[PDB]
Amino acid sequence: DFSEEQTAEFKEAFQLFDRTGDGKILYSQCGDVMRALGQNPTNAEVMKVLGNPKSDEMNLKTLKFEQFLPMMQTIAKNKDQGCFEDYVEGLRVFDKEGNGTVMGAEIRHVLVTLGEKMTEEEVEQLVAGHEDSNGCINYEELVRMVLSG
Amino acid sequence: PQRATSNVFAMFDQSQIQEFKEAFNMIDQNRDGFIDKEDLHDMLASMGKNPTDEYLEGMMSEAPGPINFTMFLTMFGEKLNGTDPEDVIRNAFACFDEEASGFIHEDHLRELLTTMGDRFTDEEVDEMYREAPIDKKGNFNYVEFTRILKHGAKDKDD
């Protein structure tokens, strides 16, 4: 582990996610905070973390700050690290004329054809951040923007 | 910390001490630079109706004997801390809701106030409800609230 600076960051996030009692942590809350604190891989880690696919009780999904720390390490061992070459090739295959004339409709289609989907307000929210025109980007600007957090 | 205010209220603008010296001059009918039973019992009676309760002895007992100009200034100085003029509160109220119409819904108000930040009880928060005038249909205006929080406006008059 690093010095106590990362423990201090986890503590201030702990007091930051103190709704409905500071002590108890929801797995949704811990997942959100760990993702935002510089760990992209969050999709299929629920089984790798809980050890139990039980996702029925939203009110009481038990987690404590003590065992939370090794969880962060066993996640941060970086089980997967992709780079933009695969992403851009997939999008250029998804692309139609090589420049991105009007990409707005088909990106929504491809994101609604995936089974593991959660949100639509984010789908309408992605227009922010240089994604303003009718799919004007050839995906390089948006890849650069997303790969900056 | 110590919170003794060793300096004479140095952590504030000095305009308020000209208003305070004007108030001191107008209360001091003896004009000796010191308050008195003779002073207040008639200057307070100028707008008041000769109150029977002996709370001016409350002042002269809060600070024993007749109080100096600087004593009055510092006993107000200990009363001001952790507060700022209306500009910053107005800007914050403009920030939290984009519309800036001051339509702070009662549910929204309680959610934004009692829940997050420094934890405190909604029961003591209710003093902002039973006393401060809240607008109808749940929303809560702030400009009048900011004015009454500052010296700009008062709920009633004597």
Binding site: V102, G104, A105, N134 | -
Partner: protein, 48 residues
Amino acid sequence: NSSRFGKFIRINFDVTGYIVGANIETYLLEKSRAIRQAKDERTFHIFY
């Protein structure tokens, strides 16, 4: 109940993919219904 008039409804979308308006038109409202009626029918619903 008889749909005794032709109609054509045009719905307007946008390049973005959202509805923006509509336009309709009717063809040849049947007449001679107020004048003498066949057996066991009625002119129109408004009169009722």
